[PDB]
Paper text:
Tripartite motif-containing protein 21 (TRIM21) is a member of the TRIM family, characterized by the presence of a RING finger domain, a B-box motif, a coiled-coil region, and a PRY-SPRY domain. Within the TRIM family, it has a unique role due to its specific binding to the Fc region of intracellular antibodies (AB) and thereby marking antibody-coated proteins or non-enveloped virus particles for proteasomal degradation. Central to the function of TRIM21 is the PRY-SPRY domain, which mediates interactions with immunoglobulin Fc regions. The PRY-SPRY domain contains a deep binding pocket, making it the most druggable and therefore most promising domain of the TRIM21 holoenzyme for therapeutic intervention.
Furthermore, we determined a high-resolution crystal structure of the potent ligand AL236 (1) bound to human TRIM21, which guided the design of AL244 (2), a tracer for a NanoBRET assay. Based on the discovered scaffold, we synthesized the representative ligand AL236 (1) and crystallized it under similar conditions as previously reported. Human TRIM21 PRY-SPRY domain at 10 mg mL−1 was co-crystallized with 500 µM AL236 (1) using the sitting-drop vapor diffusion method, with a reservoir solution containing 2.3 M sodium chloride and 0.1 M sodium citrate pH 3.5. Crystals in the space group P62 with a single monomer in the asymmetric unit, were grown with drop ratios of 0.1 μL protein, 0.1 μL reservoir solution at 20 °C. Before flash freezing in liquid nitrogen, the crystals were cryoprotected with 25% ethylene glycol dissolved in reservoir solution. The structure revealed that the ligand is occupying the whole pocket and binds by a combination of polar and nonpolar interactions. Similar to many fragments, it forms π-π interactions with the two tryptophans Trp381 and Trp383, as well as a polar interaction via its amide to the backbone of Leu371. Further structural analysis indicated that a promising strategy for an exit vector is to replace the terminal cyclohexyl group with a piperidine moiety and conjugate the BODIPY dye via a PEG linker to the piperidine nitrogen. This resulted in the tracer AL244 (2), which demonstrated desired properties. Initial measurements in life cells (intact mode) showed that AL236 (1) effectively displaced the tracer, with an EC50 of 197 nM. Under permeabilized conditions (lysed mode), we obtained a similar result (EC50: 297 nM), indicating a high cell permeability of this compound.
Residue numbers in the entry: 287 to 464
């Protein structure tokens, strides 16, 4: 299935493209509804798709970004207030922080040592195997990180953040690639 972003989930700091394949930080927050699905405290958005089974793959361009978070989450994740992105809270993600620091969302966090900074990241979900894998497309498809034995029981969602607002330092888009 072609991944698309779900506008009803998108925090007001986010701008989505018409085709729902791109998200980026605005310079101000949009004035939009405060509906239950919307992430209210962080620049986060979900894919529209709900996965219950099977293997799934998508590719995200992160070119020129100082920070981002990508992965998968439970449909049931809290949308309102503040929280950590732990597997305990229903998140399997990796991120870039501060231009150079890549990490996997294990507890404690697993530092990722990427000699070649990715411009595109490939994300695989294998529902039945309980695996979420991340590949460095730029570095000829090297494995960044794999979460294993995730033991999923309910629906999952693609998860994205193009960063925190940071005075214009991270306005480059996140784009799903064909
Ligand atoms: C807009 S979320 C975001 C966006 C980015 F562009 C780049 C990174 C993040 C981002 C990653 C991770 C976390 C986070 O939960 N870290 C805590 C550890 C999680 C794994 C288990 C040990 C504790 C946060 S947060 C919500 O604390 O702010 C944010």
């Amino acid at each position: 299935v072609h991944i698309t972003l779900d506008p009803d989930t998108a925090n007001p700091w986010l701008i989505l493209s018409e085709d729902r394949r791109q998200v980026r930080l605005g310079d101000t927050q949009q004035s939009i509804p405060g509906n239950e699905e919307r992430f209210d405290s962080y620049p986060m958005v979900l894919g529209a798709q709900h996965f219950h089974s099977g293997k799934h793959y998508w590719e995200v361009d992160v070119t020129g970004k100082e920070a981002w978070d990508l992965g998968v989450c439970r449909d049931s994740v809290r949308r309102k207030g503040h929280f950590l992105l732990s597997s305990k809270s229903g998140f399997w993600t990796i991120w870039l922080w501060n231009k150079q620091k890549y990490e996997a969302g294990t507890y404690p966090q697993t530092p990722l040592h990427l000699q070649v900074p990715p411009c595109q990241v490939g994300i695989f979900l294998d529902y039945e195997a309980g695996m979420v894998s991340f590949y460095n497309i730029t570095d000829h498809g090297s494995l960044i990180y794999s979460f294993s034995e995730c033991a999923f029981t309910g629906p999952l969602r693609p998860f994205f953040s193009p960063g925190f607002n940071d005075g214009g330092k991270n306005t480059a888009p996140l784009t799903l690639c064909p």
